[PDB]
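User: Working on a comparison across species. This one is Competence-stimulating peptide type 1 from Streptococcus pneumoniae. Can you predict its structure so I can line it up against the others?
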Amino acid sequence: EMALSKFFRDFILQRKK
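Assistant: Here's the predicted structure for Competence-stimulating peptide type 1 from Streptococcus pneumoniae:
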């Protein structure tokens, strides 16, 4: 499906500021 979906957990979640 998507491997960015792993990468997802890394970008937007560092935006939990």
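For your comparison, note: Residues 4-11 form the longest helix (8 residues).

User: Helpful, thanks.
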